[PDB]
């Protein structure tokens, strides 16, 4: 009977180990995802800047053309 | 008592499984993102191409109308 107990306890310690391990894996991945979203957003913002200049030059060309 | 210990073991087992499944979901999500990004960048490239071509034609025309 004490054997059953000892074995169950062993099992429990094992699963505590794995449970913890994967619990941290999740955390890491969540962090990684958040980083990727941040970085992605930043790069899109840079693209938007790059496009803005074109848009303005065309705007001013257009209105300037619309005066003459 | 050891029924308590059985229950606790099974709760832990539940959690280990749960976390493994969550990891697989998240890895999936990451891959899908890496796909979607790629695709969208390519779409942007296509959309820029047209403007590029029109500008090229324009620049030729402007150079040629010169005196």
Numbering used by the authors:
A (entry chain D): 835 to 902
B (entry chain C): 838 to 904
What does the publication say?
Vertebrates have two highly related Rock proteins, Rock1 and Rock2, which share 65% sequence identity to each other. Both contain an N-terminal kinase domain, a centrally located coiled coil region and C-terminal pleckstrin homology (PH) and cysteine-rich domains. Rock catalytic activity is inhibited by a direct intramolecular interaction between the kinase domain and sequences within a large C-terminal fragment of Rock containing 200 residues of the coiled-coil region, the PH domain , and the cysteine-rich domain. To accomplish this task, Shrm3 is localized to apically positioned sites of cell-cell adhesion in polarized cells, where it directly interacts with Rock through a highly conserved domain on its C-terminus called the Shrm Domain 2 (SD2).
Together, these data suggest that there is a stable Shrm binding domain (SBD) composed of residues 834–913 of hRock1. Diffraction quality was greatly improved through the introduction of a triple alanine mutation, 884EKE886, suggested by the Surface Entropy Reduction server and termed SBDSER. Crystals of SBDSER belong to space group C21 and also exhibit anisotropy with diffraction extending to 2.5 Å along a* and c* but only 3.1 Å along the b* plane. Each SBD monomer is an entirely helical segment ∼100 Å in length and the completed model minimally contains residues 838–902 from each molecule. The C-terminal end of each dimer is splayed open allowing the formation of a helical bundle beginning at residue 875. The SBDSER mutant that facilitates crystallization, positions 884–886, is located within the center of this helical bundle. The helix is noticeably kinked after the SBDSER positions suggesting that the substitutions at the SBDSER positions may have altered the overall structure of the SBD to favor the formation of a helical bundle between residues 875–902. Since SBDSER is dimeric in solution, crystal packing forces, perhaps accentuated by additional hydrophobic interactions found in the SBDSER variant, are likely responsible for the observed helical bundle.
